[PDB]
Structure 1
Amino acid sequence: VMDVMNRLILAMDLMNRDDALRVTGEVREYIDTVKIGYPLVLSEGMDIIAEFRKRFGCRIIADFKVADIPETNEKICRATFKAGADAIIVHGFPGADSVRACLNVAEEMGREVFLLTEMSHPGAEMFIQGAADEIARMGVDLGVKNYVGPSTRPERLSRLREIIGQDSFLISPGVGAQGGDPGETLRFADAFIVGRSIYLADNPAAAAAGIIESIKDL
């Protein structure tokens, strides 16, 4: 499994190239794994992945929550890996064939797929939560090794860890701005994701260092 420095992944959702680059560079000494999503990619282009690799010694997770039919999912994954992404996040609710399409491209291109089970926001309770345990089980049956679960619902994150087992890799967003606690989240997740708490701080480096200090024993 990837070695996430300090078990902390930066969710770089700033939409300005200059700001995204500045903030990421300022916390570079604390994080070697950055999650880049559509807010930044749709604002600056896929070349931003390359720019981040060139400037920082960071691993890149393309958070594209892939959720299309198998055929289109295949194209999305191919374009994303061609750009330099180490892994891609895929939604599990669209079904097994859509996930398998991503796993196939990741396999052939030598990259990784992260399967998003339950989400961290309030709305996730309407439809996703009820299908989450099965989506996770599906992922296990499909051979998925990397997963994403909600830090905002410790009981749910715990169950997801049980389903995927100790060997699977689990990352969890929702820490900070959404109310998730770093320490509690690490009881089940291999690493947690943090965006606004760091990138909106007057001193991102101090914010990141502070979060890490809170979990030094872990």
Structure 2
Amino acid sequence: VMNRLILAMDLMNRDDALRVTGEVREYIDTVKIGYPLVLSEGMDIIAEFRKRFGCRIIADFKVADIPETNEKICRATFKAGADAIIVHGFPGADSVRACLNVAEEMGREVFLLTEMSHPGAEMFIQGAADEIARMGVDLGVKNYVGPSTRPERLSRLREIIGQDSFLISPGVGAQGGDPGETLRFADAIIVGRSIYLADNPAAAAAGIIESIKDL
């Protein structure tokens, strides 16, 4: 990932999402697109971004259904041109395996979300997160998401998944996480509002990248 920085593009307007992504494109190679943008502007936005920016697109869809429905969601998402999809591990191994099977069929990747970054993640997800990560390892998952807001948890996650797995991490900036600390454990950080709500997104992205290079 260019500069170890992934843009979380959660603006809900195509014109604003295009403007900001264009302004910061020199500093990233990967955009995370989620439901705020796709449910406002349509799934065609994924191929439009891929074409316009030549970026990789991670569809942050948090897939969290039964296996049969997960299959359908993943097929529709890769048909729309996404490079990878983020999947919840909490629904269990059959639900994750269904997403892995569609990614294998379509030559795509699954990222497993293990422990979330917000305060409520402490209630139920955190207590299951090490097990969810070990389930990922046992299913052959190679890409994971874990929380910038809890670097001790992100260290434990890294310990479970090993040094060869790819780990990306949201919660940097607005939610309180720090780029440099997070990159002690994660390969890349996800940043949304700190960039896309900034008066100058390119300057916000450049400032983050300057602090990453120093690491």
Which TM bucket (shorter chain)?
over 0.9
Tell me, what secondary structure is at the counterpart of 2:174?
coil
Out of 49-58 and 200-209, give the one that drifted further. 49-58
Give, in whole Å, the separation in 2 of the partners of 1:9 and 1:53: 14
Shift of 1:113: 0.1
Shift of 1:206: 0.2
Tell me, what secondary structure is at the counterpart of 1:187?
coil
Give CA-to-partner distance per residue, 1:85-130, whole Å, 9 cap, x none. 0000000000000000000000010000000000000000000000
Measured on the aligned residues, the alpha-carbon RMSD in Å equals 0.4
Shift of 1:217: 2.7
Out of 10-19 and 50-59, give the one that drifted further. 50-59
1:128 to 120, 125, 140: 125
Instruction: Give 2:79's aligned residue.
Output: 82
So what's the TM-score if we normalise by structure 2?
0.99
Give, in whole Å, the separation in 1 of the partners of 2:208 and 2:123: 31
Give, in whole Å, the separation in 1 of the partners of 2:87 and 2:125: 14
Tell me, what secondary structure is at the counterpart of 1:214?
helix
Shift >2 Å, 4+ stretches: none
Give, in whole Å, the separation in 2 of the partners of 1:117 and 1:215: 24
Give, in whole Å, the separation in 2 of the partners of 1:131 and 1:112: 23
1:151 to 148, 154, 179: 148
Give, in whole Å, the separation in 2 of the partners of 1:25 and 1:152: 28
Give, in whole Å, the separation in 2 of the partners of 1:200 and 1:54: 24
Give CA-to-partner distance per residue, 1:147-204, whole Å, 9 cap, x none. 0000000100000000000000000000000000000000000000000000000100
Give, in whole Å, the separation in 2 of the partners of 1:53 and 1:187: 29
| Structure with the higher fraction of residues in helix conformation | 2
Give, in whole Å, the separation in 2 of the partners of 1:214 and 1:53: 27
Shift of 1:57: 1.4
Out of 103-112 and 48-57, give the one that drifted further. 48-57
Show structure 1 runs of 5+ residues with no match.
Answer: none
Tell me, what secondary structure is at the counterpart of 1:202?
coil
So what's the TM-score if we normalise by structure 1?
0.98
Show structure 2 runs of 5+ residues with no match.
Answer: none
Percent sequence identity is 100
Q: Does 1:32 align with 2:29?
A: yes
Give, in whole Å, the separation in 2 of the partners of 1:32 and 1:15: 21
Shift of 1:54: 1.6
Shift of 1:215: 1.6
Tell me, what secondary structure is at the counterpart of 1:61?
strand
Give, in whole Å, the separation in 1 of the partners of 2:51 and 2:212: 30
